[PDB]
Write a protein that binds this ligand. Structure first.
Ligand SMILES: Nc1nc2c(ncn2[C@@H]2O[C@H](COP(=O)(O)OP(=O)(O)O)[C@@H](O)[C@H]2O)c(=O)[nH]1
Ligand SMILES: [Ca+2]
Length: 307
């Protein structure tokens, strides 16, 4: 019996908001850590574990869009960050690139996690184009730093949110759509680790697919009725919000969950959907869970790496 310890760490303003909304959504068996320079923001965090970094540098304020201040602040609080991460088997670091704290502190937090032996996954946003060229440039440097510090990285360009709203969609509703990428990826790992499958995958398979890999896709899809396996698989790999699409994936962990009606044929259909869209020679780690409380619903979970 091995039950992996998962932690989700929000770094800076956008990252701490994401953690707050994940908490309100309710995600258990996961520990949440909030890291920030901005003490006023941190005081409103719902995370059980809060770390104010850089108080000597910023006097309790944010980094004023200076990534060097976010970096120095994280380095000066390294022991505090190590203590909060201690014991983790997997760490998700979420933050918005382009500002001062996230850009500079998130790669330091990720590096510490990886140096402590945790499987480290980053989920970061790129700023909207209307925030200007300098923000995008600073964000690009943060993304490169993240990629050098994580096992695997998921980038969400905020400009993609403009593809899924109408002219009236509330901004907070758009942000919740971006929140789902991290949240459902974490939930998929948790479900995979907690349930013994008929073809069982566990945390070691997660480690094999994600360790020292670079760009990643994490997706989930649910469908019912006719064509349910194909429709759920297409949903799992086709997010409009991703910088890294399924195309070019060389390693895929794929789990299918269904009721007693789960057919061998439709398991093949779903696997073929993922492999055709990859358009590559894919190493599938394939798994299957029979949940008898499910009736006509099928759930496909995909982790794709090796780009
Ligand atoms: N999708 C999303 N993006 C955010 C959110 N908050 C901030 N951002 C983006 O993240 C970038 C950095 O913001 P922020 O985290 O507040 O800066 P920092 O606290 O100084 O590191 C901004 O330029 C926005 O593009 C959020 O809640 N959701
Ligand atoms: Ca399992």
């Amino acid at each position: 019996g091995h039950m992996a310890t998962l932690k989700v760490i929000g770094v800076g303003g956008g990252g701490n908001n994401a953690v707050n909304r994940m908490i309100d959504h309710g995600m258990n068996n996961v520990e949440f850590i909030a890291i920030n320079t901005d003490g006023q923001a941190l005081n409103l965090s719902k995370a059980e574990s809060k770390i104010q970094i850089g108080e000597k540098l910023t006097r309790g304020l944010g980094a004023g869009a200076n990534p060097e201040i976010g970096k120095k602040a994280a380095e000066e609080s390294r022991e505090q960050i190590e203590d909060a991460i201690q014991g983790a088997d997997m760490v998700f670091v979420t933050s918005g690139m382009g500002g001062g704290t996230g850009t500079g502190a998130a790669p330091v937090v990720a590096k510490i996690a990886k140096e402590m032996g945790a499987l480290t996954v980053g989920v970061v946003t790129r700023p909207f184009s209307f925030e200007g060229r300098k923000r995008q440039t600073q964000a690009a440097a943060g993304v490169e730093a993240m990629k050098a510090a994580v096992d695997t990285l998921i980038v969400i360009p905020n400009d993609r949110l403009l593809d899924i709203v109408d002219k009236s969609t509330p901004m907070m509703e758009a942000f919740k759509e971006a929140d789902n990428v991290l949240r459902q990826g974490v939930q998929g790992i948790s479900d995979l680790i907690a349930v013994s499958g008929e073809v069982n995958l566990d945390f070691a398979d997660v480690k094999t697919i994600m360790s020292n890999q670079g760009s990643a896709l994490m997706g989930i899809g649910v469908s019912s009725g006719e064509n349910r396996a194909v429709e759920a698989a297409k949903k799992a790999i086709s997010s409009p919000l991703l910088e890294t699409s399924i195309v070019g994936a060389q390693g895929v962990l794929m789990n299918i969950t269904g009721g007693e009606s789960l057919s061998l044929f439709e398991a093949q259909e779903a696997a073929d959907i993922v492999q055709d869209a990859a358009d590559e020679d894919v190493n599938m780690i394939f798994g299957t869970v029979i949940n008898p409380e499910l009736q006509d619903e099928i759930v496909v979970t995909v982790i794709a790496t090796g780009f």
